[PDB]
Amino acid sequence: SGFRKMAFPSGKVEGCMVQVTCGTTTLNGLWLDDVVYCPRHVICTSEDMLNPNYEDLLIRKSNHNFLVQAGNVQLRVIGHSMQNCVLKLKVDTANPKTPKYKFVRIQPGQTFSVLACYNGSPSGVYQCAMRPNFTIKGSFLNGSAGSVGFNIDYDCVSFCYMHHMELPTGVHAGTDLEGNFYGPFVDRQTAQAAGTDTTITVNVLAWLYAAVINGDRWFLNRFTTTLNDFNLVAMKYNYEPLTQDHVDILGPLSAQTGIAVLDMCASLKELLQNGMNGRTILGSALLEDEFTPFDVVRQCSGVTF
Amino acid sequence: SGFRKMAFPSGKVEGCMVQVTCGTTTLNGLWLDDVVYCPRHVICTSEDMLNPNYEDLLIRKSNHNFLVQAGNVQLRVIGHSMQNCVLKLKVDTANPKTPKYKFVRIQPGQTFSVLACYNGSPSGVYQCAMRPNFTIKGSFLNGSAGSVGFNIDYDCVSFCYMHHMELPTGVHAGTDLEGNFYGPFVDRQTAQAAGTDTTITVNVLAWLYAAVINGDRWFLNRFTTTLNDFNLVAMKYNYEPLTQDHVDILGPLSAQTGIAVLDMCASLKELLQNGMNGRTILGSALLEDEFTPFDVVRQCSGVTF
Amino acid sequence: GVTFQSAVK
Amino acid sequence: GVTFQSAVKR
């Protein structure tokens, strides 16, 4: 029993974190085999932040202009290239701690663990979600760029996010590990702003299913809904539309609990109408949307209470 | 910017987790130097648990009755003894991954990171507080006993909790690493329940300071209060009394944000008496009490390990 | 109830 | 505005 914002154990990622310095600029890099991945804006100077030409900035660098430090060891850089908005520094040592890994680009609504780092060293680990507006609500300070987000289902690390920058409202933007930004953002300090964000409906339904698995039913009601009518109501509260794909994804939780998906949608409609009237659900007084259906099955018992 | 429930990096602890099996009972152990620590209830059958005599049950066990697995390696058990409610299995190899560590017993209100494990393999990490009623609101299923809680400081892992049991309300109880229970709980199958809890006042104040650091200021007001006036409200709302020591601990945050502790206390008093009037703080509609003053400093200043 | 959270091997 | 979260080298 219980239900927590549960991250993956961070050791397999800790073993890949290094510091990368170019000029007077430093951030974190990810050392996998003989490549160090890091945001390309490490090659900017304070003159290059609104309209850098990264091809031009990079052609001016040699291998030995990149200082890569793995704990007390300086790694030797023997090649460098850029792929979209990440640099790839080839080094002459394969990381002995490289885990089994893959790169994955995720969709909005997906969750992942973040290992926040400064100067190549870990500060802490927390759970995040990719918001519908392609930002993440992280906790990041200057020097955190190159920190990564990941999952570790089944002993393979899937790296899905690398941190680049903070937007004016204090949320965060970055790329996959191929250097392609999530959302319409660019690695320029020119004015950019998160779009209007919405609530991740399929994840709120997942978490209501978690509440039932753990023993609580107070929020259910006797009604059902069509998918159409549900979406017409939920979008009046800035919820994302629920698709038939989402309905399909919730099938296993619906089966474990005996509550049809569209009946849980009816419950959610009433919760949005009523609030919780002084109650809590899994320890919260708001409807939580950063747990996916897969996260709920990962964390909860297979036997409902 | 941002503020998340943040755990310590768990890598140092991951390298210490092993599987311990005795008979048909399996749980986790903590391998440090040449000793594996685990809950002494691993030696019990279900019938044993109704009225166990642990010394008597342990006398019947030989070293080869304890199967200890570190990844794919069986450890050779060369001795066995018990300290309070933990077993100490001496093995013939010192763990080469033993970190700098100490065993520390914490007090209610202090936080720690939990490394949830099954079958000796780390599965998740999350942040916990020791509640005033000495339970923890964990997330644990069968097989999680022997999972540990810890803090880090610079180089040193301070182990403070080893998981034993779940109570009827779904909260959790366990020991320090010397086998002493937190709370009035016993490792016997008999009726037991969490007592009524309270809210950790100094932690709520710390989180209000975190909110101010993040730009959430709507709850500040012109008023101040006194310790005695504030503690009458704390009693009425089942909050822990605030002490002078607590005020002193918040001093950093109070001189930093620009808001004195008893000024922030007048904000908390107003929130207890009036609620939040539809607003939220740091994304919560509840007053959060599982961040200590040091947790806030460590996250907001990017302390690393 | 009260559960000692070992698992069956 | 938009802030790259590199840091200045110590």
Residue numbers in the entry:
A (entry chain B), B (entry chain A): 1 to 305
C (entry chain C): 206 to 214
D (entry chain D): 119 to 128
Paper text:
The SARS-CoV-2 translates its genome into polyproteins that must be cleaved to release individual proteins essential for replication of the virus. Given that Mpro processes the majority of these sites, any intervention that stops this process, such as an inhibitor, would block viral growth. The crystal structures of inactive SARS-CoV-2 Mpro, with the catalytic Cys145 mutated to Ala, with 9 substrate and 6 product complexes were determined to sub-2.5 Å resolution. As in previous apo and inhibitor-bound crystal structures, Mpro crystallized as a homodimer.
We used 12-mer peptides, P6-P6’ (with the scissile bond between P1 and P1'), in our co-crystal structures. Six of the nine complexes were solved with the dimer in the asymmetric unit (in P21 or P212121), with both active sites in the homodimer occupied with the substrate, while the other three had a monomer in the asymmetric unit (in C21). We observed that the substrate peptide was extended along the Mpro active site with the scissile bond (P1 glutamine to P1’ residue) positioned between the catalytic dyad in all cocrystal structures. The N-terminal (or non-prime) side of the substrate had an antiparallel beta-strand conformation which was conserved in all structures, with the substrate residues and side chains well resolved. The binding mode of the C-terminal residues (prime side) was more varied, especially beyond P3’ position, and lacked full electron density. In addition to the fully conserved P1 glutamine, which is stabilized through multiple molecular interactions, the large hydrophobic residue at P2 was extended deep into the S2 binding pocket in all structures. Structurally, the Mpro enzyme in complex with nsp5-nsp6 displayed the most divergence from the other complexes, likely due to the need to accommodate a unique Phe at P2 rather than the P2 Leu the other substrate sites contain. The divergence was especially in the loop that closes over the substrates (Asp187 to Gln192), and adaptability of this loop appears to be key to accommodating diverse substrate sequences. The volume from P4 to P2’ is highly conserved between all of the substrate complexes, despite the variation in amino acid sequences; this high conservation reflects the specificity and likely evolutionarily-constrained regions of the enzyme.
